[PDB]
Amino acid sequence: STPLVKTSVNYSYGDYPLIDADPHFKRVVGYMRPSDYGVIGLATAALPAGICFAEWLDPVKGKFARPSVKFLRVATMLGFAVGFGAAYARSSLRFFGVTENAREYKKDEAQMAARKAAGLEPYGTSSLTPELQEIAAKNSAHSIAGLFIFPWFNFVNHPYHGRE
């Protein structure tokens, strides 16, 4: 888990301290707040509510009819996807130090200290070679910026997290 390339240390993406430049998927989902789950629930409700209200405004075939169950099931599925994307983005933004991150900062400090006590790597051990770890890092770093276009995540236990 020794870095092959030099990274910035505690760089400020925003007004708040940096927790992790490229957080692991498990951390980003693990640090999610109840508000983020509220966001997921709101998207999941909103998308089929959206289709129903759209049918109310301008019926597809002149006469109002409630959208079929196939479309509503679709609606729930895609709405959950949008909600999860939004919530993941919120949590990652907390990690970069762009939104308020006091709770997440403390939880990270505690978790890292415990891991160090256990003798483990701060960011885990990877089944990849270091070159593939640098390549995975350069592929996943700040990939949340393209949330609108494509989904990309960090699934690799690499050491380039931008901390000390």
Partner 1 sequence: MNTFIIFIILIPIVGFALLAVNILLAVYKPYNEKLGAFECGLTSLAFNAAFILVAILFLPFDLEISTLLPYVMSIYLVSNYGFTIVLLFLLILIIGFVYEINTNALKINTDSLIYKL
Partner 2 sequence: MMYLTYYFIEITIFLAILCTFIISAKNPMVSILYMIALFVIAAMYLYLIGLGIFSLLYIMIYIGAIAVLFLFIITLLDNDYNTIITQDWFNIENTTLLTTIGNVLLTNNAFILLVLAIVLLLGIIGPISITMKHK
Partner 3 sequence: INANPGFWNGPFRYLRWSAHNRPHLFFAFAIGIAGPVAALTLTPLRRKYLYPDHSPLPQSYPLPQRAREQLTGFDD
Ligand X SMILES: CCCCCCCCCCCCCCCCCC(=O)OC[C@H](COP(=O)([O-])OCC(O)COP(=O)([O-])OC[C@@H](COC(=O)CCCCCCCCCCCCCCCCC)OC(=O)CCCCCCCCCCCCCCCCC)OC(=O)CCCCCCCCCCCCCCCCC
Look at the block and give the residue holding tokens 């700040």: 142
Q: How far apart are CA 59 and CA 61, in angstroms?
A: 6
- Please count the other Cβ atoms lying within 10 Å of the Cβ belonging to residue 13: 14
Judged by CB under 8 A, the chain residues 80 through 139 that form the site for partner 3 are 127, 129
Judged by CB under 8 A, the chain residues 119 through 138 that form the site for partner 2 are 132, 135
Residue 5 interacts with partner 3 (CB under 8 A)? no
Site string for ligand X, 31-60 (x = CB under 6 A): -------------x----------------
Q: How far is the CB of 129 from partner 2 (least distance, A)?
A: 11
Q: How far apart are CA 23 and CA 26, in angstroms?
A: 8
SS (H, E, C) 83-113: HHHHHHHHHHHHHHCCCCCHHHHHHHHHHHH
Residue 17 interacts with ligand X (CB under 6 A)? no
Residue 35 interacts with partner 3 (CB under 8 A)? no
Q: How far is the CB of 155 from partner 1 (least distance, A)?
A: 8
Residue 114 interacts with partner 2 (CB under 8 A)? no
Residue 78 interacts with ligand X (CB under 6 A)? yes
Q: 92 or 140: whose CB is closer to partner 1? A: 140
Please state the separation of Cα 37 from the chain's center in Å.
Answer: 12
Contact assessment for residue 104 and residue 95, using Cβ atoms and an 8 Å cutoff: yes
Look at the block and give the residue holding tokens 């997921």: 40
Q: 17 or 151: whose CB is closer to ligand X? A: 151
Residue 127 interacts with ligand X (CB under 6 A)? yes
Q: How far is the CB of 74 from ligand X (least distance, A)?
A: 6
Q: How far apart are CA 13 and CA 53, in angstroms?
A: 40
- Enumerate binding residues for partner 3 (CB under 8 A): 69-70, 73, 127, 129
